[PDB]
């Protein structure tokens, strides 16, 4: 009854769709789109004297900043490295009342953040979250989905890198290589700060979401072996960060390490 609808209905919305794209990719559609772009640039030039007033420039200096990267957006690799070297050039230039009163007492997150503050006297939640959003997570995810092992050699620990190498060995036996892109990453945030050992090693937990496409190409012919150019799929990533007390003078890593990497 109702279960037979989804086979019949979903095709009928599709058959009228491409004709609509045939409507959109026609000469009238292309002419209207190009005239809309031309009059959009015309309106941009007409309201450019409105935008070039210095009071609007001052209020845009008040409003606009890098916090737009909070709301999404993907960074190209050349722009990401330019931002990294720009920041390097800038820097180098019975509920008892005691349970109620223990709100100011020391917790385990206080121990973790005190340890990471003792290691470096510039660490804070906002500064590390900014550095995590702008450099670390796009680099890790792009090197993850593009199959580059030299970038992931420095960041991962022994166990997730060994798991990733055993994963890529089968694809090497599959005579295919991985291609893909990362379209947008949003919600890069620190979930919780725990101690995960009997030895009390401090760790941090990072979560994010992204839009990705996974496909595999033949290294000889180049045809599609898996995946599709359409079907943009959404994923979430959960990482566990920690810091080495040594090798903090090593750049391009800054002493950080990833223990576990879970894709959901």
């Amino acid at each position, epitope marked *: 009854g109702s279960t037979i609808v989804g086979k019949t209905l979903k095709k009928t919305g599709e058959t009228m769709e491409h004709i609509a794209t045939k409507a959109w990719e026609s000469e009238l559609g292309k002419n209207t789109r190009k005239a809309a772009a031309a009059t959009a640039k015309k309106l941009d030039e007409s309201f450019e004297p409105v935008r070039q007033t210095k009071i609007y420039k001052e209020v845009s200096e008040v409003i606009d900043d890098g916090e737009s990267s909070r709301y999404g957006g993907f960074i190209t690799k050349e722009q990401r490295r330019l931002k990294r070297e720009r920041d390097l050039a800038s820097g180098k230039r019975r509920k008892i009342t005691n349970k109620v009163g223990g709100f100011f007492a020391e917790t385990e997150s206080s*121990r973790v953040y005190s340890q990471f503050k003792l290691m470096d006297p510039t660490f804070s939640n906002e500064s590390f979250t900014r550095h995590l959003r702008e450099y670390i997570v796009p680099e890790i995810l792009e090197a993850y989905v593009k199959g580059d092992v030299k970038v992931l050699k420095k960041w991962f*620990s022994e166990a997730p890198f060994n798991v990733y190498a055993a994963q890529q060995k089968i694809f090497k036996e599959q005579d295919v290589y991985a291609d893909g892109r990362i379209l947008d990453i949003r919600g890069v945030e620190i979930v919780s700060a725990k101690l995960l050992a009997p030895q009390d090693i401090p760790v941090l937990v990072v979560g994010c979401r992204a839009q990705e496409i996974n496909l595999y190409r033949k290294k000889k012919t180049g045809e599609i072996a898996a995946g599709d150019e359409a079907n943009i799929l959404m994923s979430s990533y959960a990482m566990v960060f920690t810091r080495d007390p040594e090798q903090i003078d090593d750049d391009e890593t800054e002493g950080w390490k990833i223990l576990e990497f879970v894709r959901g």
Partner: antibody
Amino acid sequence: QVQLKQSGPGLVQPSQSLSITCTVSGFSLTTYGVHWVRQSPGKGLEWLGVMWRGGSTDFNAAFMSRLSITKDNSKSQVFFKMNSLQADDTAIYYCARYGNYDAMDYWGQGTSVTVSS
Amino acid sequence: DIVLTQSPASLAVSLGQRATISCRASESVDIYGISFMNWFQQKPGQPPKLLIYATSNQGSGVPARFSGSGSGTDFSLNIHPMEEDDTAMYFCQQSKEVPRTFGGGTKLEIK
């Protein structure tokens, strides 16, 4: 500030029970643990047992037969109990707090336990 | 489990000179790229005091003239200026496996 103190039971008879109380101050026993370490002069330091952060306990394999470690968060106390004492256990007994990376930073006064008659 | 060994069982140095203590392990105490070995100092009538934890971090309030390094199975502790009140007994303690254990002992005096 952070300070640990101990009881003083000593000069006990052989094959008797020993009970030591470590009273902590400056922290809470549910967010820090306690190691128990003895130091005999003839056998060096050795490790008896721990009470973890999570509330579980652990002991050494050679002393698992007679060790007992319990806690009390309300009175901020840790109790140590050895059921049997012999002449080879004349030593000094310490309780120590362990913090980050399992480091025994803050140590108690330590009690001198002697076995004789 | 992990039997440790301290090399200079008897050591005597002059004032202001560098003293080096070597601690060796049976196996590797490395976990997640970090070595879990700590250093302890005991005065003749005191409980022991922590000096170095996780082989590269100073203890709380410890002066900077105590340093520690090494990895794998071999670790070392260095005091480059020798002061007259640093006459004690020194231990190294591992913190990886469940049967925790301590080193032998090192006597350090001044000629």
